[PDB]
Amino acid sequence: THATGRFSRFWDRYADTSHITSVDPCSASYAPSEGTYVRKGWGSGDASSDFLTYQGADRDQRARQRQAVAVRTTARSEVEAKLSGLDDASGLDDGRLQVA
């Protein structure tokens, strides 16, 4: 209503034009409002860590990589344990001996 008669016949002039900072929530660029407004937080260690997400993100990435490597190594080491358990003690020719 506040618009004057001129430039009110066509409101296509005042489009959204929100393509700047139009990053979709599914995109990696998106940052919520609570994430934007943060302080350095000298007094609180939790606040300092919240300011330094990227250091925490790097620590978590390293921890996840090391845990994945550990899981892979444990499974593999079980595999070589099963493979190297095979020897003369195992009854590989027991059936042949029984048949003879």
Partner: protein, 430 residues
């Protein structure tokens, strides 16, 4: 009785002061509100009749943002509101702006509050001035404040923990200009100047703390640990107490030569902690490692003139003597011919406190190595050509002239830095 007044000038000074005062509050048990649930705090805090402790500090800046961040943060009830001093216009990386036009009224009020603070101290060991060589607020206003302090207080020991521009990486363009100006200023005013380089501390954090993305908060935390180790002998008793007055006597060979490399040890994260012994000899060797220098200046190039070692925690004089004997016998470390001893050891029985949320681990032993060595001439040599390279074309000279400076001031600062180079070369030479 052992009061030390802290001054923090500029964004860098105030941001390292935040870490310093967080560390001091955690060390003395003082809560952020101001009060704690003997008399070891008197060095940094003055208690009121209500039991609340207010720090003997002064946060000076010509920009309101940094100081208002402190006024809004957790330590809003700790510091004195008038002790936080805020300007109106920033110095805009201009030494002339921060030294001649804007800095005048601000430094007048700063001296007023500094006098009020010093009137509340029975003794006064000295001033701890934390500024940024390379910014108008830090360089210009800091230089003016140091000059006024020298004029009025006189022989009070001023320890300037300055941050000098890094060799290659930097954040400013007029940084060589105002750095040269401030160095000319403080060559004759500060008693002991400690050099700090953001590049060196970044490398320290990247290698030792395994922080692939180091930041100013981590740098300030490391600097705060260094200063706390330096001042621990004032606050907590121990064998071989070393004082602010003894720093100069045992570290400064001549009045001109008082710039000092600083290095802390150990710098180890919690995950990498308790994997090594961290003995006295090992931490001393780590402190003497050139990579552990908090300044991008390889000491192998120069010769050590004096080395003050501040040990914290479970440290015994036999171990410090063995470590220093091994250091002397090491061929890589070289001392000047005219200084046979060149060592000043001081032990303290208080281990360094750990800031929650920080990366440093709880280590029972710590060393702060502050050394005067002629290697430091390298950084002045870098700034001396970075200055004259721009000065040849007189780039950014009109900016400095506009606020009441002259080309003669630039010439004088450059000549003074050349003379400082010559003095370092002379004292290094036999």
């Amino acid at each position: 009785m052992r009061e030390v007044i802290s001054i923090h000038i500029g964004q860098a000074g105030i941001q390292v002061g935040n870490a310093c005062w967080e560390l001091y509050c955690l060390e003395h048990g003082i809560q952020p509100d101001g009060q704690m649930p003997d008399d070891a705090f008197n060095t940094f805090f003055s208690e009121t009749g209500a039991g609340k402790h207010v720090p003997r500090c002064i946060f000076l800046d010509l920009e309101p943002t940094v100081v208002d961040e402190v006024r809004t943060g957790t330590y809003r009830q700790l510091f004195h509101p008038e002790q936080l001093i805020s300007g109106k216009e920033d110095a805009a990386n201009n030494f002339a702006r921060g030294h001649y036009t804007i800095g005048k009224e601000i430094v007048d009020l700063a001296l007023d509050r500094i006098r009020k603070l010093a009137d509340n101290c029975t003794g006064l060991q000295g001033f701890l001035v934390f500024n940024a060589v390379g910014g108008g607020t830090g360089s210009g206003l800091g230089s003016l404040l140091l000059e006024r302090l020298s004029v009025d207080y006189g022989k009070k020991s001023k320890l300037g923990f300055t941050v000098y521009p890094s060799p290659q990486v930097s954040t400013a363009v007029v940084e060589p200009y105002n750095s040269v100006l401030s160095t000319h200023s403080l060559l004759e005013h500060t008693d002991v100047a400690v050099m700090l380089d953001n590049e060196a501390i970044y490398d320290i954090c990247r290698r030792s703390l395994d922080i692939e993305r180091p930041t100013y908060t981590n740098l300030n935390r490391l600097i705060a640990q260094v200063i706390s180790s330096l001042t621990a002998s004032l606050r907590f008793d121990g064998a071989l107490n070393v004082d602010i007055t003894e720093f100069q006597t045992n570290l400064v060979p001549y009045p001109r030569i008082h710039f000092m490399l600083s290095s802390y040890a150990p710098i180890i994260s919690a995950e990498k902690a308790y994997h090594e012994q961290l003995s006295v000899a090992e931490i001393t060797n780590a402190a003497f490692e050139p990579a552990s220098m908090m300044v991008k200046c390889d000491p192998r190039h120069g010769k050590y003139m004096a080395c003050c070692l501040m040990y914290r925690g479970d440290v015994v004089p036999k171990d410090v003597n063995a470590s220093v004997a091994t250091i002397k016998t090491k061929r890589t470390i070289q001392f000047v011919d005219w200084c046979p001893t060149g060592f000043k050891c001081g032990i303290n029985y208080q281990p360094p406190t750990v800031v929650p949320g920080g990366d440093l681990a709880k280590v029972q032993r710590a060393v702060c190595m502050i050394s005067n060595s002629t290697a430091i001439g390298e950084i002045f040599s870098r700034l001396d050509h970075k200055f004259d390279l721009m000065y040849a074309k007189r780039a950014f000279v009109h900016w400095y002239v506009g606020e009441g400076m002259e080309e003669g001031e630039f010439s004088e600062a450059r000549e003074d830095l050349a003379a400082l180079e010559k003095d370092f070369e002379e004292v290094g030479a036999e």
